[PDB]
Design a protein around this ligand. Structure first.
Ligand SMILES: Nc1ncnc2c1ncn2[C@@H]1O[C@H](COP(=O)(O)OP(=O)(O)OP(=O)(O)O)[C@@H](O)[C@H]1O
Ligand SMILES: Nc1ncnc2c1ncn2[C@@H]1O[C@H](COP(=O)(O)OP(=O)(O)OP(=O)(O)O)[C@@H](O)[C@H]1O
Ligand SMILES: Nc1ncnc2c1ncn2[C@@H]1O[C@H](COP(=O)(O)OP(=O)(O)OP(=O)(O)O)[C@@H](O)[C@H]1O
Ligand SMILES: [Mg+2]
Ligand SMILES: [Mg+2]
Ligand SMILES: [Mg+2]
Lengths: 471, 478, 471
């Protein structure tokens, strides 16, 4: 018979022994349901996922919840299939956990509903689509220096408290409410307060009727933090494949998945990698990221916020995830501390759509000129650091004069940021952004003070606030 | 039908342990009950360590492992031209099976000391800076090293496209990339017509670590088949760092003790073995050649790192791409001071050798002198002329994406620059000067182009000077 | 007669079990000569070297070639002696591998030829010779600041791409053509292209009839790379001891011996050392280096190229190698980036021969003055790069003026550097270079441009090259 027994319990890792010739395959889901026989036991309802075959009819699993109360010899049932979560029209407007069980207090889902396995292979080479199309966001720096791509993968790197969540919320406000297709939000190891705030925001804004949310936050154990992203991904994949619709996929923090994997790896019996990470860091991330892609049936555009530990961009987890992205924006603590509030690094951020045949010749030229002036200012910053601006030549002084104003004009006031500073946000068309930056490069506004370029939208507001102040 | 069989003990993360297989061979292919192939790496006293070359989900403890009797082999032949294939040789483009009737070992000895000939014929990449400062010859292996988003893939794509008329087979190996990126590269090659003579081998990120580990060896094995028939082959390894990381993952999974940065002990031997198989064969061996362009990605421009140091210690030269140069406007962002070619001169046309024999050292000295004299007043007229010449050379070396230039035009523009005919042209106008100079040669200087293309030496300087003066008279400075 | 069987194969390390009381001694050679019984096997001809005794009649060995094809249970033959290679006039004009088998396709060595064991103890204290004599090389910087010693040990340090191989080739060209004795080249762990080029150059020059070459290169397994140096060493030792000849020993790269030794320590079962090296680093390096010495019966002068990983001179391999040398040449890539070749560091280079009674008082004083001037110049660069040359005193301005010219005149054009420079090479005697540096120190040529000193040879060529620029 297909019933196991608990052998070892080591935190989130549980070993189960089965009968000979009846071992469950890898990624199968196991169930433990125990009733307390006496006052020295507790009730248990726990699910496990098969990870390795240890030999001697023993299987090593990862738990999806707390393992407190487990006793050696408990009976374990094998479901014969991986974790399956409901998919379809039923999941719209609902909130789910890692196991696909609703948590919004609106009732259960009928047991006859269609549900798909969590684990599946990635789409083949011949099914992919490689069209490049500009996606307008209304943010000046993103629209100018690193345009986003419709149907592509976008990553937002940054440290703690730099603005990743605010940028996610601004993008949701600007794009999701008008996208028209299905939107999926999959938080991974983030604040439950933030999840509740986003849920109430969507419910009040009415976009909740066409979105599905899955949540595995920081309170949860590493197995749930590892599999919540896959649950959200398969929910999005159903809409991409069976209906051919455009899907927005938001992942709140994809670094937490690799962090939970590294937490689990040590107990599984693997030798540590360079910085203590799991040796399988690259393959585990790759087999997740390759499923998030656009195909011939439909397109999925995904915006992922990526956490950078200890502000070290050379850390293996941030380092290996660059190759999976079409456009990236790098947030910097130095730029946020000077008040530049979108904090996007104008030289580190790159996009594949910044090509003359995609964005236009004048767009490309303006972007290249801005990048060149910013690079020259970065080079000069060492000399200004020690001996100031007095010894700079007349050319370098003009370069600094233009670069400071360009850097300040790269700032913008966001609609979401209205709660922090009482000012209302702005939405800037890309044509207006190009015209404003070309005018600044041409030297039209050299006489304006540099503090008049901060937190404004169109170039006319710079003149308006310079007139408001002394001029 | 009978075969030696074993039983599976452990399964996980692409690594399997087997009991039995007493007569198994070190490096022999093995197959599982469900058809997935494997490779035997560790032959211990009582068990065998097998690395699974495919999806290991369907493999369970107690399953049987079956010997094949073959050392790791890959299909070879002309049927692979124009196809994208797995590192095991199976097509992934969906255009049908490949009809290969021959195979080669994936681990084979490199050609010996007496089997080689000195590199003496040029490989034209179509890029002015590479062709002038860092020449590449047939049989040479040149490293392309730099940070992310600096043009490393673009250089290789342009080099592959430039081989359209020159008789050479191209092989592009992609390790650890997105299949969408690979498809974009294939679409670019099909657009530019390079797919008629190019084989592309892909090992994406979702594939298991052994496929990434074996992809460069499969590529070089496919190249050797053409090399030993007298043909000339160009092989591109788009990332050796990801292959090294995959090998580290495999070694750690096989319980082999780690070294520096958790890398195994033979991480240098891996790349040395891979790269020593590219060579220029002697006339007794057929005269064929195989040239390689390995890629290394640095972190924040750090060159003292383990893998970059190891790869630099192996290849014949390196090309440096820097982000600060990239954003300053000079593209390709080749650092002339750091880039070097150990076969330079011998791998150049006679005219190019005449016109640019010193240009790399000239640019290195100019870069040294620009840092000095920046604080001062550039008083000396000699220093004031060296800086002027350096600025003209730097602005001349710039080039646009997917804009190849024939070597006959390259030598002419380098001659015009280095003989002093650009001394009376402002820096901001020399690019348009060159653009119009090419049309002027196309319209009135066909004989010079034909002479350079037929006899590899320069024409008489009198006619060339007269043509340059005529173009200068026609030209107007803006 | 006794035989063993293979019980375990782990990459380049093979374990063999023998019968009781018939174990092979350490460093003995073993042979595997399997013939394929059927189509499921391949023919094998492999040589192993005994490294450890593991107990239970088991011996751990290191393979001299690829271990692909090995099968557990293969019969192994013990030869009862270490690796033996032919010695004598037979080796002259021939090219050998690590096993002493010729690879030049010129025929096989007769079986009755004398063969010597690879491993032997080092010469004793009584029999060593310590007389010092100057070896003239024709290179200005070497002859001025760090003279080489006849019968001594010379090491060339440098990173990747600094000019070690070119310097080796130039030294060979200058010395081996007029040496009159025997010369041996050891190609340890370098490029087969470089080996072939050197072989063809020597064949064309005619030195090939007076030299023996042994090659173990990058493609070879670690055992070949760690025993080829000993093969070349014993070939040179035969000539030193039996015939009393003067022997030039050239080693292509001695760091590859250390690297190959470290590649297999973990498989041999030894705990790692500081930077991942083997624990026996210093012991093995000393046991190899101490055999390369001059004695009363004959003298061997050895020039070795030493690789410095990542330009870090504090790396354990160069740090341990430093103590084994009499004269030391340091190559820094800072001089290479600036276009100065051979890019010898004028300060870090040292030699036991730079003494007033060894080289002469005038030479000693001019060399010390040059070193003092360069040391003074090195300090001024840090303040120059910030405050400019205008703030320097009149003394320091002259110091910089003369130091730049001295550093530029330290360059030279080599005969083998035609491929890289177009212009031919030159040979500068020690008296001429001392005179030229004395004149430059006195300041005769302050009016000459600094560019006129680049790769020029003598000062006569400097003043003639100045005419080409109109000075
Ligand atoms: N556009 C903005 N305008 C004003 N303040 C901002 C803006 N973006 C971010 N901030 C400030 O930065 C703080 C942190 O932002 P946010 O929560 O988005 O950071 P994060 O990168 O998600 O950090 P964590 O790692 O804590 O989740 C905000 O509370 C706010 O004070
Ligand atoms: N000569 C050039 N002129 C203009 N743009 C260029 C040039 N060379 C490359 N680029 C652009 O630079 C960007 C980066 O190039 P590419 O993707 O080939 O670099 P990479 O180093 O291979 O990057 P990755 O790290 O993403 O693999 C691309 O948008 C490409 O179009
Ligand atoms: N004296 C010189 N004159 C001209 N060019 C030189 C000189 N020395 C070195 N170079 C240049 O620098 C390169 C250095 O290559 P070389 O083979 O000498 O390096 P190495 O320091 O021995 O390194 P490795 O053996 O680790 O590869 C040469 O190929 C050549 O381009
Ligand atoms: Mg956040
Ligand atoms: Mg690339
Ligand atoms: Mg060398």
């Amino acid at each position: 018979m297909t019933r196991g027994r608990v052998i070892q319990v080591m935190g989130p890792v549980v070993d189960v022994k089965f009968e000979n010739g009846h071992l469950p395959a890898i990624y199968n889901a196991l169930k433990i349901q125990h009733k307390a026989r006496n006052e020295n036991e507790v009730d248990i309802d726990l699910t496990l996922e098969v990870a390795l075959h240890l030999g001697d009819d023993t299987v090593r699993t990862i738990a999806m919840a707390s393992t407190d109360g487990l006793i050696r010899g408990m009976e374990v049932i094998d479901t014969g299939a991986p974790i399956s979560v409901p998919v379809g029209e039923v999941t719209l407007g609902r909130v789910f956990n890692v196991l696909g069980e609703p948590i919004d207090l609106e009732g259960d889902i009928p047991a006859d509903a269609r549900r798909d396995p969590i684990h599946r292979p990635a789409p083949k080479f011949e099914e992919l689509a490689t069209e490049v199309e500009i996606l307008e966001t209304g943010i000046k720096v993103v629209d100018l220096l690193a345009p986003y791509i419709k149907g592509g993968k976008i990553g937002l790197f940054g440290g703690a408290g730099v603005g990743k969540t605010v940028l996610i919320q601004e993008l949701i406000h600007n794009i999701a409410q008008e996208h028209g297709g299905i939107s999926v939000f999959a938080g991974v190891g983030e604040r439950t307060r933030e999840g509740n705030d986003l849920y109430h925001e969507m419910k009040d804004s009415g976009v909740i009727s066409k979105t599905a949310m899955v949540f595995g936050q920081m309170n949860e154990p590493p197995g749930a933090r590892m599999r919540v992203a896959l649950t959200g991904l398969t929910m999005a994949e159903y809409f991409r494949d069976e209906q051919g619709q455009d899907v927005l996929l938001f992942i709140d923090n994809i670094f937490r998945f690799t962090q939970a994997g590294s937490e689990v790896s040590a107990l599984l019996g693997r030798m540590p990698s360079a910085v203590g990470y799991q040796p399988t860091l690259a393959t585990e991330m790759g087999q997740l990221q390759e499923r998030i892609t656009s195909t011939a049936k439909g397109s999925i555009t995904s915006i992922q916020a990526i956490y950078v530990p200890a502000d070290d961009y050379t850390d293996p987890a941030p380092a290996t995830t660059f190759s999976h992205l079409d456009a990236t924006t790098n947030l910097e603590r130095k730029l946020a501390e000077m008040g530049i509030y979108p904090a996007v690094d104008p030289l580190a951020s790159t996009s594949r759509a910044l090509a003359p045949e995609i964005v236009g010749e004048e767009h490309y030229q303006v972007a290249r000129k801005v990048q060149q002036t910013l690079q020259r200012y970065k080079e000069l910053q060492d000399i200004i650091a020690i001996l100031g601006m007095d010894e700079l030549s007349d050319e370098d002084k003009l370069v600094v004069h233009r670069a400071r104003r360009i850097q300040f004009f790269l700032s913008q006031n966001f609609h979401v940021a209205e709660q922090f500073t009482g000012q209302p946000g702005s939405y800037v068309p890309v044509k207006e952004t190009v015209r404003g930056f070309k005018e600044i490069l041409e030297g039209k506004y050299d006489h304006l003070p540099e503090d008049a370029f901060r937190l404004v939208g169109r170039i006319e507001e710079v003149v308006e606030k310079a007139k408001a102040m002394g001029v | 039908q009978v075969s030696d069989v074993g039983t599976v003990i452990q399964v996980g993360d692409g690594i399997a342990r087997a009991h039995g297989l007493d007569n198994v061979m070190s490096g022999e292919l093995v197959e599982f009950a469900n058809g997935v192939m494997g490779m035997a790496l560790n032959l211990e006293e009582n068990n065998v360590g097998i690395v699974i070359l495919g999806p290991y989900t369907g493999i369970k403890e107690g399953d049987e492992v079956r010997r094949t009797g073959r050392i790791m082999e890959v299909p070879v032949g002309e049927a692979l031209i124009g196809r994208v294939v797995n590192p095991l040789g199976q097509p992934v483009d969906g255009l049908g099976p490949v009809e290969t009737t021959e195979t080669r070992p994936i681990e084979s000895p490199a050609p010996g000391v007496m089997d080689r000939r000195s590199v003496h014929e040029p490989l034209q990449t179509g890029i002015k800076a590479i062709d002038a400062l860092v020449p590449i010859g047939r049989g040479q292996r040149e490293l392309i090293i730099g940070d992310r988003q600096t043009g490393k893939t673009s250089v290789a794509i342009d080099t592959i496209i430039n081989q359209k008329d020159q008789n050479m087979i191209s092989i592009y190996v992609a390790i650890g990339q997105k299949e969408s990126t690979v498809r974009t590269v294939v679409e670019t090659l099909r657009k530019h017509g390079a797919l008629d003579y190019t084989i592309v081998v892909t090992a994406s990120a979702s594939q298991p670590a052994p496929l990434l580990f074996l992809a460069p060896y499969a590529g070089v094995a496919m190249g050797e088949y053409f090399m030993y028939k007298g043909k000339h082959v160009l092989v591109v390894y788009d990332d050796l760092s990801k292959q090294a990381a995959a090998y580290r993952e495999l070694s750690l999974l096989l319980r082999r003790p780690p070294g520096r940065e958790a890398y195994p002990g033979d991480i240098f031997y891996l790349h040395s073995r891979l790269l020593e198989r590219a060579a220029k064969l002697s006339d007794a061996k057929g005269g064929g050649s195989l040239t390689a362009l390995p890629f290394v990605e640095t972190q924040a421009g750090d060159i003292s790192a383990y893998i970059p140091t190891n790869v630099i210690s192996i290849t014949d030269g390196q090309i440096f791409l820097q982000s600060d140069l990239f954003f300053s406007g000079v593209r390709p962002a080749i650092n002339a001071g750091l880039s070097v070619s150990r076969v330079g001169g011998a791998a150049q046309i006679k005219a190019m050798k005449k016109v640019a024999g010193t240009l790399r050292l000239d640019l290195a000295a100019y870069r040294e002198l620009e840092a000095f004299a920046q604080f001062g007043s550039d008083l000396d007229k000699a220093t004031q002329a060296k800086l002027a010449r350096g600025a003209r050379t730097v602005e001349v070396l710039k080039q646009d994406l997917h804009q190849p230039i024939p070597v006959e035009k390259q030598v002419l523009i380098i001659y015009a620059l280095t003989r002093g005919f650009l001394d009376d042209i402002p820096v901001e106008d020399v690019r348009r000067f060159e653009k119009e100079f090419y049309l002027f040669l196309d319209q009135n200087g066909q004989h010079l182009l034909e002479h350079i293309r037929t006899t590899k030496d320069l024409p008489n300087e009198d006619d060339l000077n007269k043509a340059i003066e005529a173009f200068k008279k026609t030209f107007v400075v803006s």
